[PDB]
Amino acid sequence: QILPPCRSIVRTLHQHKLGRASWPSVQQGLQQSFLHTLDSYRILQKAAPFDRRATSLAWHPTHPSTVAVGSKGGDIMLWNFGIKDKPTFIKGIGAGGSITGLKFNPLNTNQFYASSMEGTTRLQDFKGNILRVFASSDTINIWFCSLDVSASSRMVVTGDNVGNVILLNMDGKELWNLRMHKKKVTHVALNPCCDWFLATASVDQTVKIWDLRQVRGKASFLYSLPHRHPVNAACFSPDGARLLTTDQKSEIRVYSASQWDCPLGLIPHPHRHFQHLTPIKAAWHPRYNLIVVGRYPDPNFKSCTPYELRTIDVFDGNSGKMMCQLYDPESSGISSLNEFNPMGDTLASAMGYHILIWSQEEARTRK
DNA sequence: ATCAATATCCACCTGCAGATTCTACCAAAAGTGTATTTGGAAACTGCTCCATCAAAAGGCATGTTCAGCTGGTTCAGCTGAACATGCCTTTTGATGGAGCAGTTTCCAAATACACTTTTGGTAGAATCTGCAGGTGGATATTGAT
């Protein structure tokens, strides 16, 4: 395979110590170094099963080794590494209560937000106590699909199966529930560097950029970006300037700050949507300009590589092409969800009925 | 050697090709109503193709079942020839019912409106059923004679 990297590494660091070379060149060199050491994540560290399929994933923001996960049957799990304290569990109905959105609480880490097929955007503890419901369908067969949160703004946002989005405060205060789309809202997210423009994606083959404080007039939006197929995810950058989008058939798109309408590059990659599989969500890496996605081969997709395996692919953002591929037998499932740690030293993967941890090996000999 | 079957010829004769004449129904023309097609919202049903257990499909050992073959025994249908008998047929005397054609009286659908049951929508509990025991035939496996 490819993975060639080269450079005059330490020199640049000293160049940075002299002021000659600019910081983005440093960021590029250490991005390459990060890829080189990610070539040693090949040894899969840990595996974890449980009951009904995995649907949503989330990282403990402050802690590297802690992670939370939510199932197809409303079964939530909280798991920490190097603890061995037999991780924490909570069950649900198990049939039609699929948790589908899951973000940690920025305030109380022993709390968590959740969006469920039951029709209940809730705030609940890992010990089982429901602290507070935020919204409700009040009529079954109409449920939520999307959820996200912001701490700098102290806001909650959630999306439906019909095309209307809801926006609440941390203490209630609902001033929202206007309709935005014609179909289900697959993903949604707020800017981390801003507080008052939003992004939402839907089955309508359109992804919309809103201004949550200015617009109130039922599709008096700010921007609307089209696509050729429906969209499973539209995720913001940490920096805030790059919006990543991933469709259902075969595509990834990078939109910029600079003219949201036009895209900067198209990254073709197979992640074909499917009914009983968990929907695929590309994701950023929090401290570089990389992209990470899970692959799902299609015999009809125009493959550039002659070898098409199920594996975790890692591309470069501002170029378009690939830079690394992680693969491990005994894990021949399809990695629906993949998310790097906010810390930057660990990767979590959610496959059907399985959760995988990929971190570096070392510790050749103890003393 | 056969010995009716088919190939050949020839009288004949009656269905059959062909010509004539009456007739009911097919085509064209202007009009209309009414089935159907089309544009377009929307809803709902099948294609979907992993991730997973768990009955179901495959495959291999043993054992039994029976089937296409043998040969023999039994015996029952084929057919000659002779002779009876009702079929043919034909032939015509007898008749009544088929079909037509005129007369009478039934008796069905056209239409408008106002009930009236029928079909869902939707919950509650009554019956079927998984599961678990548990009786008792029962059905094969040895057992006394």
UniProtKB/Swiss-Prot annotation:
Post-translational modifications reported in the UniProt record: Phosphorylation by ABL1 negatively regulate UV-DDB activity.
Biological or metabolic pathway of the protein: Protein modification; protein ubiquitination
Effect caused by changing L198A: Impairs interaction with DDB1
Any GO molecular function: DNA binding
Effect ascribed to mutating D204A: Impairs interaction with DDB1
Spans annotated as Photolesion recognition: 274-276
Name of the protein this chain belongs to: DNA damage-binding protein 2
Organism: Homo sapiens
Gene: DDB2
